[PDB]
């Protein structure tokens, strides 16, 4: 698909069998989801955003279906104002910026 | 052009006669530039994200050139770690997300 930017580029994703709404975010190196339980072990990690650093739980090799396209990568879970799909997963589905 | 996401999508922009490097961010509602003394009247405001909120100065109708493409809009100046071009300016240069 081709998505214009008049509205936040929010799309439905499937993860852990659940359906969620997430922002396609070219300015995020990582994928960060609001607190939820994902199967498997996690490791404490810290990441920075515009307002500072937060602590997150890191889950590796998690399959995520973004608008029908499959990706399997690292997903961070922590206090984010919105679920964001970052460049680590956007590259797997072949997302590019065009103008 | 077409920009892949293997690396952060950084491009050269021009504002206030200055040439800069800024991240094209589909996950930013606004444009936020690192601390700089632009002549002009501004209004204070707060924007947030991962980590919380930061105080920024809002400047309106500022001419901004993004990789040869002209745009004009609101620019926020504040203690941001990176210069960020948000949707308010990306929509003006016809930028789309494609996959």
């Amino acid at each position: 698909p081709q998505i214009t930017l008049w509205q936040r580029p929010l799309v439905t994703i499937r993860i852990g069998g659940q359906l969620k709404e997430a922002l396609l975010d070219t300015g995020a190196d990582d994928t960060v989801l609001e607190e939820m339980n994902l199967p498997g072990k996690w490791k404490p990690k810290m990441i920075g955003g515009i307002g500072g650093f937060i602590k997150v739980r890191q889950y590796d090799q998690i399959p995520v279906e973004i608008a029908g396209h499959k990706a399997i990568g690292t997903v961070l879970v922590g206090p984010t104002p919105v679920n964001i799909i970052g460049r680590n997963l956007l590259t797997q589905i072949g997302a590019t910026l065009n103008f | 052009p077409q920009i892949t996401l293997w690396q952060r999508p950084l491009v050269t922009i021009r504002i206030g006669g200055q040439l800069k490097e800024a991240l094209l961010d589909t996950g930013a509602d606004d444009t936020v530039l690192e601390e700089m003394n632009l002549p002009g009247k501004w209004k204070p405001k707060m924007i947030g994200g991962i980590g919380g909120f930061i105080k920024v100065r809002q400047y309106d109708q500022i001419p901004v050139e993004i990789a040869g493409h002209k745009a004009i809009g609101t620019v926020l100046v504040g203690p941001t770690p990176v210069n960020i071009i948000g949707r308010n300016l990306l929509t003006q240069i016809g930028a789309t997300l494609n996959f």
Partner: peptide, 5 residues
Amino acid sequence: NXPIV
């Protein structure tokens, strides 16, 4: 990682 809301 920048949302900017």
